[PDB]
Design a binder for this molecule. Structure first.
Ligand SMILES: [Zn+2]
Lengths: 182, 96, 197, 49, 8, 107, 49, 63, 309, 149, 64
């Protein structure tokens, strides 16, 4: 997560030579999607990115207290001028090359320093893979992964009577029975 | 500052990717009127909208007309009204 | 952004985009020809999507015609004030309307209206002509194409430069807000039928 | 299981007919999560989180 | 971005 | 134990073959793709990585004018070796002409 | 319209009528659970607002 | 957040203590973060975050 | 156009700008991005080094743990030449002279008797309370005492703070260096970061004069536009366009976004190879050029072994 | 000669509708030797056109001027000295609509031609006597060269 | 807890720059000059040493 309420899940550890390196030499550290913004409207991650980039470039620690920036002295005409003093772009956009190809990306990329965090809500570490499962005493069927009464409904909606006969009859609790046919 | 197609937010909004033409107006123009379960935010038991505002104050700022954006900043009354309008939706989802 | 009128690849990049779109298909990858032959061999971004369509429509089948509309309207491309051209409806040659003829993409911009979860588009028209394998390949191949145009040649970002406002069209905002703190009383005299004095 | 076999894929709540599908397996090495293409995570009503 | 000493 | 496979178009066509180069990535297959596209007997040379969890590249070489695609592949390998040997030579001869002006200037 | 126009009315009608015929619901459709779910999955989206 | 909980790990016997090796202080922070001395127990690490749609494994709340 | 080899042996030149210990900056004029990126991506992930892989603890009675200490030791650059050593063959925990190195970090911490009256400065109170990387005794094995001089197998920096101890608290571990490339684990990478940039050209399409030249000199990085007087007016000219950080600040200025044409020069890269000290940066670039060749040799050997005819 | 059309045009207006695509300019024109208009998109980085520039225009079916052969496949490695490339800016694309103001008659005296050059469009409206060879889905070349007088 | 041996982003040894950074800030440098004069020029390297809470001088007080 960040400090602006914007969770991510770690999807792919991308090798470092494949990352889009910048014109200063830097690779990034976390790539964030530009499609997490317009429905969530966290402008504060943009100002924190410009602000932390400009604080790591000057030895400063920048004041991010609420309600101190007005509309006549904005939070983007302040850190933009801090970055213009540090040589970089006014809008936080640095020219990135690529690493899967080798040449320059034509639309300049917003980069900066954002304080990420790490939630305890971890990966489940519960992969319930089942094969030759143990049978209980009453209803000797898997003790196991559950098919479910509502999934029967969807398989009947397909018209797949034999996938359903497989998962219900052939996999769980198949037995023979002897009947006096008279 | 940059229009469509150069604008990335207008490209995500107008090509159906994620946004809408309401979130971009809350970003770069006013937030507009705060409605709270259909109406303007509640006056107190003494007829003042919030402790900053005079009892029965005529100005639209008393009834939640925020008129400041997420770009430049929200002042604290226009923020308390906005938190009412957010807790209203989160409560009406979480209960029923 | 690819199928917009401004894209112009060269020969080494078109052949990389097409083979990022496709992958180890059992068959010769057939290619289009330049949209611009001289001063430089150039391939428009519509020709990459066209090359990708023809190469996953199967061998015996002929390609599909289509016509339709996109989600970007013609009012979204306008920058100046449109002078009225005398004998010319501006919508007849416009990027709102998608015109696919014989598989090649000849006009219009592809959007959610065509290759997303919106009906009567390209990846649904390839369901009710070709089948289920072909449409589920058009989704995969256009996905791999449209990502491997972002790894390699253009990036896509969001900054503090695309949500900002001009300094001249922000004084015409602080002369409306200054008018918007004076409309207190007159909305109550007409709400409670009092006179004006 | 090899790289053509069908696994039958289930996401709860199984509230309509495309809430169970038949996906061809593809054994990706060195991983411990399932993987889906993005077109599938609207029929399953999936949110990746 | 110093000028190269082993030049043309 | 070998680290190159060749997958024909139909078992008979030898112009199109998709070379499967095991234990590579975009380091070699982007510079092979640069050299083979400099061969005018190639209609199409492109590469793709199969899946990033895997460790091989697909390399489609598609030759016009009746050549097998082993010859533009071999020519594009030797023609990249002959780039790197020359880059190695002009780099080891400009490090040496820099050490022979750092030292023999005032010392 | 100055295009090819290889087809006429007698064959346009035939393709539309054979598309009507080929689109008949085939025997075994289990339409009852397709109409028990089309009023059972959008009846979970109906919150009270 | 998995952060730095406490300093006395030996004499405390909680069920689960989620410790983060090498936590940093935030370079951009409000003034209340120092009024309460939250650098005694910080929660996260800074990161050089780029906002790019470079890969394709990078959509729908993933990074 | 086809590949004229005598157009590459005529328009390629490496211009070394600045080389010292543990840094290098040079040009490569006339090479395309697909070979330059190959050199960059072999410097970062394919040029091999030596680095710590197994740690054998006994009495880590320290606050820095048994796990974080091992990971922290693995990220320490070891100044053994990689090319003298082989890959350790798989499934062999014990090593031999060819494959492994061994160190030993044995540090006890005990109270200081002398020079400790009514003070609290920690150097005066404790001995061995900062375990630095100069505490790593190289334990040579087999016959490695003859191949290498006394004091060459060594940690590179000798000032790296591994742990921090107190009295009673002890570290007694033994290490095993192995060989690997910077794709197996990134503790094996020999470069700080290797990166390239194109060379900018800034072109003044219009003669700037007077009060606009001093405005133009501050829109670029310090060093690019010099503003010098030519008969009463202050004209501006370009000077070292290499210094320009390409921040596009002149395109914010409306009067002067029409008097510059800020672009780049095609195939005029500027590398920068900073080593971590395991190898000098002029042998890292040569052993990055000599790995792309081996990747091209191995596949020609495979084709020679496949076809017999 | 496979010349489907040949005339001398004069740019009178540039992008009047105001859409302003990047790298592409829309060029409204009029003719000299015929009575026609022209609405063409160019590439403006490579071949720049300003208003007031006369240029000859040729739409041909084949580029081989020694007989109509109509190959179709693009070969960069083969160059024949019988190409029609004495012009400067050469495009390629197919005709997708032709339309006219017929009133229960055939091929009225104001016929159009809509050519899509990979995305860049074109409208060549004029007399039906000058637009014979335009059939729908015919893959034609565009050949233009700037005059200076 | 303790300074990392390498910077996270690019692998520069910054783990030897903690005592000779306290020594520069005790000798009255500003932090915008105690990082340039240690040779940390990129803002990922400066970040590691500017925003570092060395939380082992607080954790060794609880020692046997
Ligand atoms: Zn760094």
């Amino acid at each position: 997560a960040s400090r602006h309420g914007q969770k991510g899940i770690l999807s792919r550890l991308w090798p470092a030579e494949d990352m889009p390196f910048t014109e200063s030499g830097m690779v990034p550290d976390i790539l964030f999607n530009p499609h997490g913004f317009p429905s969530r409207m966290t402008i504060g991650m943009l100002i924190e990115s410009m602000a932390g980039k400009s604080a790591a470039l000057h030895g400063l620690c920048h004041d991010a207290t609420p309600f101190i920036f007005s509309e006549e002295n904005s939070a983007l005409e302040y850190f933009g001028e801090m970055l213009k003093a540090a040589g970089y772009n006014f809008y936080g956009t640095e020219r990135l090359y690529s690493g899967i190809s080798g040449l320059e990306l034509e639309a300049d990329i917003f980069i900066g320093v954002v304080y990420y965090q790490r939630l305890r809500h971890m990966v489940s570490d519960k992969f319930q893979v089942r094969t030759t499962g143990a049978r209980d005493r009453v209803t000797n069927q898997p003790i196991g992964i559950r098919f479910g009464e509502m999934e029967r409904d969807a398989l009947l909606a397909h018209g797949t009577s034999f996938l359903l006969h497989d998962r219900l009859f052939n996999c769980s609790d198949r037995s023979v029975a002897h009947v006096c046919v008279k | 500052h940059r229009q469509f197609p150069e604008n990335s937010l207008q490209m995500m909004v107008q090509s159906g990717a994620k946004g809408s033409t309401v979130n971009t107006m809350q970003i770069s123009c006013l937030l507009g009127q705060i409605e709270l379960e259909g109406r303007r935010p509640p006056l107190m038991a003494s007829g003042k909208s919030l402790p900053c505002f005079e009892p029965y104050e005529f100005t639209p700022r008393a009834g939640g007309f925020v008129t400041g954006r997420f770009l430049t900043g929200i002042k604290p009354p226009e923020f308390f009204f906005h938190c009412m309008a957010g807790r209203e939706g989160l409560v009406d989802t979480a209960v029923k | 952004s690819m199928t917009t009128r401004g894209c112009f690849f060269t020969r080494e990049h078109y052949m990389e985009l097409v083979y990022r779109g496709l992958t180890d298909k059992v068959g010769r990858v057939k290619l289009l020809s330049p949209s611009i032959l001289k001063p430089f061999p150039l391939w428009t971004g519509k020709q990459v999507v066209s090359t990708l369509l023809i190469n996953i429509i199967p061998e015996d089948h002929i390609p599909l015609n289509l016509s339709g509309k996109a989600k970007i309207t013609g009012k979204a491309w306008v920058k100046e004030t449109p002078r009225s051209v005398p004998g010319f409806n501006p919508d007849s040659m416009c990027e709102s309307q998608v015109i696919i003829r014989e598989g090649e993409l000849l006009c219009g911009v592809l959007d959610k209206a065509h290759y997303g979860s919106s009906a009567y588009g390209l990846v649904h028209c390839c369901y009710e002509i070709y089948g289920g394998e072909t449409s589920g390949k058009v989704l995969t191949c256009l996905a791999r194409l449209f990502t491997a145009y972002l790894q390699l040649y253009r990036g896509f970002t969001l900054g503090v430069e695309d949500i900002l406002v001009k300094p001249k069209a922000d004084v015409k905002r602080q002369r409306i807000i200054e008018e918007s703190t004076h409309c207190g009383p007159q909305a109550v005299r007409a709400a409670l039928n009092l006179p004006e004095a | 299981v090899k790289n053509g076999d069908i696994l039958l894929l289930n996401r709860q709540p199984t509230l309509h007919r495309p809430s169970i599908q038949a996906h061809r397996a593809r054994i990706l090495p060195e991983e411990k999560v399932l993987r889906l293409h993005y077109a599938n995570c609207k029929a399953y009503n999936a949110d990746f989180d | 971005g110093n000028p190269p000493v082993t030049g043309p | 134990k070998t680290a190159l496979e060749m997958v024909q178009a139909a078992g008979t066509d030898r112009h199109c073959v998709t070379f499967v180069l095991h234990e590579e990535d975009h380091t070699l297959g982007n510079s092979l793709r640069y050299m083979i596209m400099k061969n005018p007997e190639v209609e199409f040379c492109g590469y793709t990585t199969t899946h990033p969890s895997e460790s091989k590249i697909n390399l489609r070489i598609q030759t016009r004018g009746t050549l097998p695609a082993v010859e533009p592949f071999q020519r594009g390998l030797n023609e990249l070796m002959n780039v790197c040997q020359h880059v190695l030579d002009k780099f080891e001869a400009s490090i040496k002409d820099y050490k022979d002006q750092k030292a023999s200037r005032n010392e | 319209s100055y295009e090819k126009s290889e087809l006429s009315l007698d064959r346009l009608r035939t393709l539309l009528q054979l598309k009507w015929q080929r689109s008949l619901c085939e025997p075994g459709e289990a339409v009852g659970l397709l109409a028990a779910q089309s009023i059972g999955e959008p009846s979970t989206q109906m919150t009270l607002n | 957040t998995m952060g730095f909980p406490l300093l006395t790990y030996q004499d405390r016997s909680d069920n689960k203590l989620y410790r983060l090796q090498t936590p940093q202080s935030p370079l951009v922070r409000p003034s209340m973060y120092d009024y309460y001395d939250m650098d005694n127990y910080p929660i996260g690490t800074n990161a050089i975050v780029a906002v790019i749609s470079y890969t394709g494994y990078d959509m729908e709340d993933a990074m | 156009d086809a590949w004229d080899q005598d157009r590459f042996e005529k328009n390629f030149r490496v211009d070394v700008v600045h080389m010292d210990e543990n840094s290098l900056e040079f040009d490569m004029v006339g090479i395309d991005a697909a070979i330059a990126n190959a050199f960059r991506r072999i410097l970062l992930a394919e040029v091999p080094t030596m680095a710590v892989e197994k740690v054998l603890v006994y009495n880590n009675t320290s606050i820095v743990q048994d796990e974080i200490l091992a990971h922290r030791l693995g990220l320490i650059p070891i100044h053994a030449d990689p090319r003298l050593f082989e890959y350790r063959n798989q499934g062999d925990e014990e090593g031999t002279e060819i494959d492994t190195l061994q160190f030993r970090l044995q540090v006890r911490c005990t109270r200081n008797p002398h020079a400790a009256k009514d003070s609290s400065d920690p150097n005066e109170l404790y001995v061995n309370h900062k375990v630095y990387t100069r505490h790593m005794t190289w334990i040579p094995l087999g016959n490695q005492a003859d191949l290498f001089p006394e004091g060459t197998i060594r940690p590179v920096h000798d000032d790296i703070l591994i742990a921090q101890l107190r009295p009673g608290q002890e570290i007694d571990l033994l290490m095993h260096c192995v060989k690997g490339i910077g794709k197996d684990h990134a503790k094996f990478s020999p470069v700080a970061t290797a990166s390239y940039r194109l060379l900018p050209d800034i072109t003044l399409l219009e003669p700037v004069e007077g009060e606009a030249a001093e405005e133009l000199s501050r829109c670029f990085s310090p060093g690019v536009i010099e503003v010098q007087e030519v008969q009463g007016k202050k004209v501006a000219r370009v000077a070292n366009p290499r210094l320009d950080t390409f921040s596009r600040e002149i395109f914010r200025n409306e009067k002067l976004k029409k008097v510059v044409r800020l672009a780049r020069v095609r195939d005029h890269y500027i590398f920068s190879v900073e080593s971590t000290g395991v190898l000098p940066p002029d042998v890292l670039v040569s052993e990055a050029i000599k790995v792309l060749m081996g990747k091209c040799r191995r596949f020609l050997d495979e084709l020679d072994a496949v076809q017999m005819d | 000669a496979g010349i489907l059309f040949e005339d001398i045009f004069d740019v009178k207006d540039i992008d009047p509708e105001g859409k302003k695509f990047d790298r592409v300019s829309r060029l409204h024109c009029e003719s000299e030797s015929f009575k026609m208009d022209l609405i063409l998109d160019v590439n403006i980085q490579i071949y720049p056109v300003d208003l007031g520039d006369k240029f000859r225009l040729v739409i041909a079916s084949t580029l081989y001027e020694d007989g109509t052969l109509d190959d179709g496949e693009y070969n960069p490695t083969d160059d024949r000295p019988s190409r029609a490339d004495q012009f400067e800016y050469v495009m390629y694309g197919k005709v997708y609509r032709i339309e006219g103001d017929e009133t229960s008659t055939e091929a009225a005296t104001r016929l159009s031609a809509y050519v899509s050059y990979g995305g860049l469009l074109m409208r060549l409206q004029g007399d039906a006597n000058n637009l014979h060879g335009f059939e729908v889905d015919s893959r034609v070349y565009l050949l233009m060269k700037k005059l200076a007088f | 807890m303790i300074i990392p041996v390498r910077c996270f982003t690019c692998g520069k040894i910054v783990g030897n720059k903690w005592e000779a950074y306290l020594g520069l800030l005790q000798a009255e440098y500003t932090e915008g000059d105690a990082l340039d004069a240690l040779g940390l020029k990129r803002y990922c390297c400066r970040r590691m040493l500017l925003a570092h809470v060395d939380l082992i001088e607080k954790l060794l007080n609880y020692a046997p």
